[PDB]
Amino acid sequence: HMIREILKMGDPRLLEVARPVDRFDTPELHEIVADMFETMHHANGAGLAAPQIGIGLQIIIFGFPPVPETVLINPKLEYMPPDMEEGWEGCLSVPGMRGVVSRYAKVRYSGFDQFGAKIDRVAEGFHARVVQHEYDHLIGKLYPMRITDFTRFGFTEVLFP
């Protein structure tokens, strides 16, 4: 549909807590989802959250072990301790950088698609990492807030030439 501007870290809209979607299968919600996919694809992103395009709603999309192409609305996550994994992340809202972030190796997630149909899955590894990363956007968190080792945070061009 249309490519929307991705907000950058420092924008206070990225720090807010997103509100739930109350009505499903509306033209307005279908446009949002279409806008998010075009904006995501345009950036070669593996996920996107509505607050990143300035829409303060609990909507995430992802899909790039194939990660299934998914619209997840009003997500509920369950973290599965104690197995954590470190890995490199970047964010379309933190352009130019990468940092190592510890994530749960496995999570459960549920919610609804844009039609209101239920979604309910257990995810592992990169799939689970993407879901955690996008969920964080809905609660005001960007991945530098999760970093504990800032010697492993820097510019992509320097870390991975």
Ligand SMILES: CCCCC[C@H](CC(=O)NO)C(=O)N[C@H](C(=O)N1CCC[C@H]1CO)C(C)C
């Ligand atoms: C990895 C967990 C985060 C996934 C989502 C982000 C996109 C984003 O900002 N979503 O909110 C992404 O695709 N990031 C990519 C990313 O971090 N990648 C791409 C695959 C490997 C990894 C970098 O090591 C690039 C495009 C910056």
Ligand SMILES: [Fe+2]
């Ligand atoms: Fe992000």
